């Protein structure tokens, strides 16, 4: 009955949306961008090393001051390091030792952490008493938490393994918007420079684009071929990169509705776990599963550097807000500041 | 003066490091386990809301930390990677609608061949052995039409018969074990090991089988450090 009719309009809509992308695919940044100046081999060396964690590090996030750094490990710790002098400013003992994400507030007052407990706990650093304690216990999700990001001191965007993203209100503790439309587990998210839009790559090989004002899904991209494990916004706010489990990274775009470049090498066979951009959006440091941080190039698509100072897989990667340091975490509890 | 706040941080880095050292001892003194039992197989009572139901229990001054993963979705490929540091993976199988055994045979193969879980041993708990002795003794013999190599199968010479069991069930119980012990030997490399066990979900000593099996994993892990084994 209508089941077959529903597929006739869906296939035509998928073809109508595919032909429109082909019309805007004049060059795909492959024939005109070849006449640029490649920066060549950019060699980086580890300047600091944080070996205070006991279990595998799963996430990290820099603050607005670019000095402090919070790291989450699988031992029930939320140590807040001082990247300048290597000082453990705080050591928050978490309830559930299964932590899969962490974030730093844009003001440096609060810190969040999720994990397999489905709870996004908020901790207040600047307390009048001087100690640290959980400020809010956000509950409601039905799947493991993958990534959390702060809009402001009272708003926080999360993403769980229940194919749905959320937007909570720390003041009351209840969510206001529940983004829905993904088929696979959402693995990461990244806020735009302007806190109005954010992307979220899921396990269904589809990277969408939401608007924090409503529950509307602006766009959807399906360039990759496996579970998208990482995502990050371009410093300009009109593009974003996507790492997936099929050993390739693709730079998408919002105004083009399709992928521009596809960074891939014949030797790499391991999936990407973490990606991020530089201050000028010229470098794309992808964290592969081969214990190496292959520094790609957003323009030339050529691997211009490799960071191999890690024993285990690189589970997280964060560049500073000013571009001075690139802190990469790994499963051997060694967070080296590059 | 501008260096007086440094000792205030070095003392903050002293008590925290003193706490990061007393916590390092209690962390490595507890062995984290993973209960990945199949649904409707008595996984909760195999040793006897929230994303993970912790379970603290000690066996001879050894506090284990089991994590029953509940209230999660169907797809497990992404969240099974967080359990690579655990000592073992308690795998409970329902030995008895659709095909229940093949659903647990294809899952064990995925865990065994997962790149992150190739160094994590798996403890196998073949549950519902009391119900197994009733399906093969009389009624629908669903083990014969769901497996074509069971008719031309004989019980091995290493079988230890138990009192009160039918010989047709012993040939069936050990057949399911050989189906699990075929993937763990062919696709294996020698890093992780599989320990099969027989349970009826009512055993009052299930904490001893996990205790002895965990002692064999740490010994085999220590033997790998000195390049002995």
């Amino acid at each position, epitope marked *: 009955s209508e089941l077959d009719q529903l597929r006739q309009e869906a296939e035509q809509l998928k073809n109508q949306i595919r032909d429109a992308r082909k019309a805007c695919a004049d060059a795909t940044l492959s024939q005109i961008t070849n006449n640029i100046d490649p920066v060549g081999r950019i060699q980086m060396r580890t300047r600091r090393t944080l070996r205070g964690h006991l279990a595998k590090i799963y996430a990290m996030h820099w603050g607005t001051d670019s000095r402090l750094l919070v790291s989450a490990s699988q031992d029930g710790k939320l140590i807040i390091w001082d990247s300048y002098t290597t000082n453990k400013v705080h050591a928050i003992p978490l309830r559930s030792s299964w932590v899969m994400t962490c974030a730093y507030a844009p003001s440096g007052n609060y810190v969040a952490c999720g994990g397999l407990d489905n709870i996004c706990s908020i901790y207040n650093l600047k307390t009048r008493e001087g100690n640290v304690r959980v400020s809010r216990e956000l509950a409601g999700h039905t799947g493991y938490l993958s990534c959390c990001r702060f809009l402001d001191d009272n708003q926080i965007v999360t993403s769980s393994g229940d194919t749905t993203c959320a937007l909570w209100d720390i003041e009351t503790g209840q969510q206001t918007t529940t983004f829905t439309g993904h088929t696979g587990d959402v693995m990461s998210l990244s806020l735009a420079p302007d806190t109005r839009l954010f992307v979220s790559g899921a*396990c269904d*090989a589809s990277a969408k684009l939401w608007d924090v004002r409503e529950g509307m899904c602006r766009q959807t991209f399906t360039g990759h*071929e496996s*579970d998208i494990n990482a995502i990050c916004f371009f410093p300009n706010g009109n593009a974003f990169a996507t790492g997936s489990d099929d050993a390739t990274c693709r730079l998408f775009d919002l105004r083009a509705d399709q992928e521009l470049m596809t960074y891939s090498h014949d030797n790499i*066979i391991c999936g990407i776990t973490s990606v991020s951009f530089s201050k000028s959006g010229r470098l794309l440091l992808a964290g592969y599963d081969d214990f190496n941080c292959n520094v790609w190039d957003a323009l030339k698509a050529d691997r211009a550097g490799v960071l191999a100072g890690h024993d285990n897989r690189v589970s997280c990667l964060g560049v500073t807000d000013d571009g001075m340091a690139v802190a990469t975490g790994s499963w051997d509890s060694f967070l080296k500041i590059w | 003066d501008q260096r007086n706040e440094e000792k205030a941080q070095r003392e903050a880095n002293k008590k925290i490091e003193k706490q990061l050292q007393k916590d390092k001892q209690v962390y490595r003194a507890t062995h984290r386990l993973l209960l990945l039992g199949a649904g409707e197989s008595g996984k909760n009572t195999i040793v006897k809301t929230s994303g993970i139901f912790e379970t603290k229990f000690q066996v001879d001054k050894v506090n284990f930390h089991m994590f029953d993963v509940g209230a999660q979705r*169907d*797809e497990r490929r992404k969240w099974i990677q967080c359990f690579n540091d655990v000592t073992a993976i308690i795998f409970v199988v329902a030995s008895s609608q659709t*095909n229940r055994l093949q659903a647990a045979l*294809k899952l064990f193969d995925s865990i065994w*061949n997962n790149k992150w879980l190739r160094d994590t041993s798996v403890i196998l708990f073949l549950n519902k052995q009391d119900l197994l002795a009733e399906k093969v003794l009389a009624g629908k013999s669903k083990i014969e039409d769901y497996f074509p190599e069971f008719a031309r199968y004989t019980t091995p010479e290493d079988a230890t018969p138990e009192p009160g069991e039918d010989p047709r069930v012993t040939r069936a119980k050990y057949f399911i074990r050989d189906e699990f012990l075929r993937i763990s030997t062919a696709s294996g490399d020698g890093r992780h090991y599989c320990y099969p066990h027989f349970t009826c979900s009512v055993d009052t000593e299930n904490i001893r089988r996990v205790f002895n099996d965990c002692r064999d994993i740490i010994q085999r892990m220590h033997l790998r450090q000195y390049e002995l084994l």
Partner: nanobody
Amino acid sequence: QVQLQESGGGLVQPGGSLRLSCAASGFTFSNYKMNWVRQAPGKGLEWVSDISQSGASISYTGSVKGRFTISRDNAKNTLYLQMNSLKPEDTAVYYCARCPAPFTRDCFDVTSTTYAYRGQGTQVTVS
């Protein structure tokens, strides 16, 4: 865009034959494993048979071992399931599931209640 479309179907008598041609467009067909999952009426998704990356291992379930035959054509990206001597209990939809990640010997969540790299299925009913 991982798109898996199948063909075949219709009514066949017990003991007949059918060829389920599963198309695959949008990904490298060689780098990924292939699977066959069927959904009985009012029952859960069960695994039938899988094939290795390039014709290496051909595993079956209990009921289809010897009766069915799965083969892939890497030059045409078409997965086949040569069915022969069917039984009146084989009346079920036939999805063409793909393994989640490439160049691995592990396959996870192919029989899940909801998965992304699966097909629409064909109503292979037996008269």
